[PDB]
Design a binder for this molecule. Structure first.
Ligand SMILES: [Ca+2]
Ligand SMILES: [Ca+2]
Ligand SMILES: [Ca+2]
Ligand SMILES: [Ca+2]
Ligand SMILES: [Mn+2]
Ligand SMILES: [Mn+2]
Ligand SMILES: [Mn+2]
Ligand SMILES: [Mn+2]
Lengths: 237, 237, 237, 237
């Protein structure tokens, strides 16, 4: 099985796998049963923004989510990612629906990783920024039901020709290049990610959510990971 | 009196003001008596690099210092800088000598500050990078004995025409623009700084050190702040 | 008199000073009588974006302006800016109204300048990005009628309490730090700027326009530079 | 055959394929017979730096090369790259030796590409920076004799265990992700690259050179492209 670290924007409360009884933001370390959660006042049909930050000095994975005109939600968890993830990873976005559903539309995604060595300075970095997505977006690896180019956006889960979200859908987008998150000479390693999203549903109960994740380079959607598993995990262990 | 937050590279042990009995890196919050220190294996005559990082989510000020071919030293301290510093600050480098002495030569200095609001994204930033310093470096405010342009470098303390460091010297360089470190709409604020330095002395006992600092915009060198006070503090309280 | 280089977004045709008979984008080198113009299909009440680029190898000042859902306009002019401007400059935005009027609202402004020397690499840079403007925006020098903080924006010219633009107004905003655009060791120097603007008027004939400019560090609004002079020039020579 | 655009640092004069009678920098558009050259005072055994710049407004490919303590060389050529290259490309470094030889050592490589659309702003970008290269550098595609990790560097051509360069060698390194250089909504597209290199030879006549290139995504070393063909072209047409 893959190795996954993720920040989840979890729209549906599954209380038997430890979700709180409300939409929430969570930090997931090798399990869908988040290590830490915070209440998230999710707004159906509004564009929101998520930010994720980490560095190897402090060893704290943190995230913040907001909408215009609204207060933010934040969550943090102390974890040494070099003890969880391999030295080379891929980074991605994932989303799912089940019997309950929503659009999982990404309007923008940026990421920056840096490795500073002890050689005079000495800086190594990767940065990408998407503010549109075209039909043939060659620097993304699309998995499952994910598509690019409809209204210039990344649709992680299936949307009907009329714009209605579909149930029982899972999809992911991974950046094409592998990312180097640990190196033996690094004195500080850091990453930051931001994405803007639009979660809409005809229903009072949207599901299931969107996640930013970091994985082994060869990660793939686990079998049966629709719905509450967010396209990330094979089971709820 | 000014308000100062600093990371010190302290080359001389002053044990009556709480220094450990060796060169050390420290976090200074409104006092020269560091809140946290770590041992620093300072190398006379070699170029080193320091990195300083902070964000408002985690509220942890961290620093790392290294030389080529050597292990690093690191220190961290939990502190909410919005409860210490004003909303607008200046950022700078400071150094001093006393009866013991050293060169306090800066070969490069970079800084990045970011304020992310809840408006769609919404990013505000300041970045500067110096890899040389000319004679008339109009975007630096020089204080005390600091000069620019000798061999293209920033000499924080006085150096004789022959290159010998002088005693009883203090000097600082502040970036010209004020820096916005808190704003009411920000959901995450962060800063990072890096500088490369060359501390050389003819003597077995160099003094006194170099610091990266953040201050009120109108900060000036305190009277009598040569030597152990690092150009930062009026007394050792 | 100041030395000015500017890219104008000129909303009102003043045919006796060489304007074409339509709104236009122009390159202004020490005169309001542009060296080069292109037709600009200005849209009253819509948010547009302008981009300005230059480097010292090619010695070509270029600009592009667009709106969502619309084609762009572009203009270029061959000019060695080191023969026009001093080594240190300030950068700014300017706008004016006369007997005809418009709002001259800035929603965002970014700028990046780089100087690459022949020392191993060797990079020097300044970058700033504003996506909001607060009441007391200490890193901007405001001149004339310019204000910050109304709806989080920079209003270059006066707007009544009800939001109606006023006539006979001029205002500018300059970044606080001086900018180094030439240095003797530089092998390549470049700059880029972007700003987003909202020009609205109750009238079929808006005036007078918005400009991005580069000037001597001590530049000030010339006497009598309302209206067709764009807050930039003392006369129409 | 591949499609190649390159900036060559050509160390050996092959006068029957149009080289000048001295080491030179050149712009190569689909042929090893440069469209434009400039004299290059190459220094055996010293670390140099090359810079390459282009944007779609000006349609001018420019390059500058220098050493510390020395004047620069520059070359430019007017060319619309959207009429030469496909919309998606890979970027790389190439080098070769023949019967004459040299080390073709890369100490650092950075690249930035940007696509600005007409949507509010709207920025898309890719950036990478290498200041070291490890043994298993997963974000590089190595071709031919290229290796990474010896003394932390990228050795484009073969070097014996004792450090002597070998003859009859060719090697390339391409960044792993495809790069988007044209898009239908872009109003400005640009790229910049920088690399630092060390060309050393025991011989009074080093050969053959190093190039930065942009190619179709599936580019490979052409058969027989050692020596004067620089690992880029199948023949000297
Ligand atoms: Ca759930
Ligand atoms: Ca001390
Ligand atoms: Ca006019
Ligand atoms: Ca040749
Ligand atoms: Mn959950
Ligand atoms: Mn101390
Ligand atoms: Mn005009
Ligand atoms: Mn040639």
């Amino acid at each position: 099985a893959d190795t996954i670290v993720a920040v989840e924007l979890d729209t549906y409360p599954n209380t038997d796998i430890g979700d709180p009884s409300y939409p929430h933001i969570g930090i997931d370390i090798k399990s869908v049963r988040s290590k830490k959660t915070a209440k998230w006042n999710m707004q159906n049909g509004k564009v929101g923004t998520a930010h994720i930050i980490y560095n190897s000095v402090d060893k704290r994975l943190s995230a913040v989510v907001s909408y215009p005109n609204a207060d933010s939600a934040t969550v943090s968890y102390d974890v040494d990612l070099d003890n969880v993830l391999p030295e080379w990873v891929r980074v991605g976005l994932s989303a799912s629906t089940g019997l309950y559903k929503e659009t999982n539309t990404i309007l923008s995604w940026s990421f920056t990783s840096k490795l500073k060595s002890n050689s005079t300075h000495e800086t190594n970095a990767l940065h990408f920024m998407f503010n549109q997505f075209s039909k043939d977006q060659k620097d993304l690896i699309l998995q499952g039901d994910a598509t690019t180019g409809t209204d210039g956006n990344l649709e992680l889960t299936r949307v009907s020709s009329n714009g209605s979200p579909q149930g029982s859908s899972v999809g992911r987008a991974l950046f094409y290049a592998p990312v180097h998150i640990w190196e033996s000479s690094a004195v500080v390693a850091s990453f930051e990610a931001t994405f803007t999203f639009l979660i809409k549903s005809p229903d009072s109960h949207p599901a299931d959510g969107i996640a930013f994740f970091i994985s082994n380079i060869d990660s793939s959607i686990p079998s049966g990971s629709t719905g509450r598993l967010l396209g990330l995990f094979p089971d709820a262990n």
